[PDB]
Design a protein around this ligand. Structure first.
Ligand SMILES: Cc1cc2nc3c(=O)[nH]c(=O)nc-3n(C[C@H](O)[C@H](O)[C@H](O)COP(=O)(O)OP(=O)(O)OC[C@H]3O[C@@H](n4cnc5c(N)ncnc54)[C@H](O)[C@@H]3O)c2cc1C
Ligand SMILES: CCCC(=O)C(=O)O
Ligand SMILES: [Mn+2]
Length: 455
């Protein structure tokens, strides 16, 4: 990367906001995944959207790849600079604007995390529900199409993103639904917002997101329920969803995951396949949700172990399951699967996955958003054992292909990044791949917007 180019970047954002130091580049060359760190050639922190546009235009016209970088919590290698280039760290734009409580909407810049937003919203009666375990950038969550434990009731990012401000690869500024607009529904033109949700930084740079807010629940009850088998836990889940109980949270942990979270968070749940449950409503709405849910679990479920601080540590432990699993083998890294299947096929694929981890020499923990038909197999990898890392990728492929055989998808929320590109090709077939690539080509003709990812 030439000295004239660096000085051009510094002219846009300021000398302190451009770095070519190896240490700073290495810190931005990886996320939380096991994907080998590939450092960008520079890191740049734009201070406003005009600077984002001007950095993108500079890179694009000089043939330099651009890698958007939020909080670096992705798990599929999205920020790895496989072709070098300029990593654009967006987190200095960190303002919340246009809070419209009467309309249930708010606009956030990329440095705003979910915690920051919900802190800003205390005593408003509103909250933002989509809750990845990591303290992630909300614009990064829009870019990956994130979900979380609350999505079974309150929806994913795709359900809760109303508008996006996007700097296209050549620097043009697009407001996907129109500048300043926010509304409940529209048939106006083609829906551009949905195209950029889940685009993983390959179609442009999200510089603000307009989010749907929700009313805080009148009352909340959380509980855990221990089961004699994985089959019993997932059968309960399927029957709870088919009975149309509007559960707020329904999270599965197998016995390996439960033990790991016990040891990492000083919980003391019985070591067993377990459901973490949460219910929202009034006292009366809660009583019959609990009535009907506990009748279904009583598939051999234990009496509910009920859980302010007490449910807070329960869901903090769930949110840290990734780190709980890594703590089972210090020094190792991890890869997560993320399949999502039609709910009636969930029992057979979790039970099969449990059996396959057991028959394997790999250490694997199972956790996830089974209310969506989605779950994660967290597989540990020694960063120096190439042969374990191949057993893990092979396990991951086979699980992905089994989900596709059942009519499902290879990723419910994490995205494709570097690790699921071949699965995506199988998932949508030749016409789907070409159509996706034609969209990529019209927005990013030179292929400089996060190259090597998704397609
Ligand atoms: C402990 C833990 C728990 C997690 N739990 C969940 C979970 O429940 N659900 C879930 O969905 N994910 C989960 N994740 C994954 C991760 O938090 C999400 O994928 C999150 O949305 C990533 O946001 P980020 O800004 O940290 O991404 P980054 O790693 O910074 O980037 C991710 C990808 O998005 C692109 N990108 C980032 N910001 C932008 C932007 N502003 N514009 C355009 N492209 C951009 C990057 O180029 C990259 O390809 C978890 C991760 C961890 C470590
Ligand atoms: C990062 C994999 C774990 C995850 O997504 C979760 O905690 O739900
Ligand atoms: Mn998850």
């Amino acid at each position: 990367l030439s000295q004239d180019f660096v000085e051009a970047l510094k002219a846009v954002v300021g000398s302190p906001h451009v770095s070519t130091a190896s240490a700073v580049r290495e810190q931005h060359g990886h996320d939380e995944s096991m994907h080998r760190c590939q450092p960008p050639d520079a890191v740049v922190w734009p201070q406003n959207v005009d600077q984002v546009s001007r950095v993108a235009s500079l890179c694009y016209n000089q043939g330099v790849p651009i890698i958007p970088f939020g909080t670096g919590t992705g798990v599929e290698g999205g920020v790895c600079a496989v072709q070098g280039g300029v990593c654009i760290n967006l987190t200095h734009m960190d303002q919340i604007t246009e809070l419209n409580t009467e309309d249930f909407s708010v606009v956030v810049e990329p440095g705003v995390t979910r915690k920051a937003l919900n802190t800003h919203l205390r005593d408003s009666g509103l909250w933002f529900p989509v809750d990845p375990g990591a303290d992630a950038s909300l614009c990064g969550m829009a870019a990956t199409g994130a979900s979380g434990t609350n999505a079974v009731r309150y929806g994913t990012m795709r359900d809760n993103v109303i508008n996006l401000e996007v700097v296209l690869p050549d620097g043009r500024l697009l407001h996907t639904a129109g500048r300043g607009r926010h509304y409940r529904k529209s048939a106006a033109g083609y829906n551009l917002t949905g195209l950029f949700v889940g685009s993983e930084g390959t179609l442009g740079i999200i510089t603000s997101t307009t989010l749907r807010l929700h009313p805080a629940p009148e009352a909340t009850v959380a509980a855990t329920c221990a089961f004699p088998s994985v089959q019993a836990a997932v059968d309960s889940t399927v029957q709870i969803l088919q009975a149309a109980v509007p559960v707020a949270r329904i999270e599965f942990l197998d016995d390996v995951m439960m033990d790991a979270c016990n040891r990492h968070s000083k919980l003391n749940c019985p070591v067993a396949p377990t459901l973490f449950l949460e219910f929202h409503g009034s006292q009366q709405t809660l009583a019959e949700q609990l009535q009907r849910t506990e009748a279904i679990t009583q598939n051999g479920g234990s009496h509910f172990s009920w859980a302010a601080e007490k449910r807070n540590e329960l869901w903090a432990a769930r949110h840290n399951a990734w780190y709980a699993a890594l703590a089972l083998s210090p020094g190792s890294k991890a890869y997560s699967t993320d399949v999502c299947v039609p709910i009636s096929r969930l029992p057979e694929i979790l039970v099969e996955t449990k059996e396959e981890i057991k028959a394997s020499k790999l250490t694997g923990a199972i956790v996830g958003h089974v209310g969506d038909g989605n779950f994660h197999c967290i597989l540990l990898v020694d960063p120096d054992d190439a042969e374990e890392q191949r057993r893990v990728k092979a396990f991951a492929e086979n699980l992905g292909r089994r989900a596709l055989a059942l009519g499902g998808t290879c990723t419910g929320e994490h995205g494709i990044g570097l690790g699921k590109r071949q699965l995506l090709q199988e998932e949508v077939g030749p016409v789907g791949v070409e159509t996706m690539r034609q969209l990529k080509n019209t927005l990013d003709p030179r292929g400089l917007m996060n190259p090597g990812k998704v397609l």
